[PDB]
Amino acid sequence: GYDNREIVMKYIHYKLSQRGYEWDASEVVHLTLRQAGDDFSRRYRRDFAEMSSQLHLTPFTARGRFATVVEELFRDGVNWGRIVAFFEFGGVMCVESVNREMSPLVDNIALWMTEYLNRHLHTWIQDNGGWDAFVELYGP
């Protein structure tokens, strides 16, 4: 386990580099989340195909859409699958930001994700075994 900020930073850096974008700022947690995120994306590629246009992302819409989506995602519960979806949704927001010539937003989204993990998911994560539990359920 340890630090949510680093977990976010590493996840976002990886998702962006996959699209060839280099973003200026144990390891088993980072790798496991990468693997899970990639399988999530691989499986539900088609399902979220339209998403980037559904997002309709602008500097004025970004924070509101993030809140709306993340708050609704976890309204009636939390589980590791929903958390992986959360990370993937963030990744999509970042990729779309660069695409819509809003690359500075990437830093804001990383902050929003970090804050949300620290202030709203932290309790559930610790009560359910920490990132160590995630590693055992999802990783090698």
Partner: peptide
């Protein structure tokens, strides 16, 4: 609230696919 409920449905289904034991 689309995107969020259709992430949620699929997150839950995904968390199936990775059910304990």
């Amino acid at each position: 609230i689309x995107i969020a409920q259709x992430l949620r449905x699929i997150g839950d289904x995904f968390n199936x696919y990775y059910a304990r034991r």
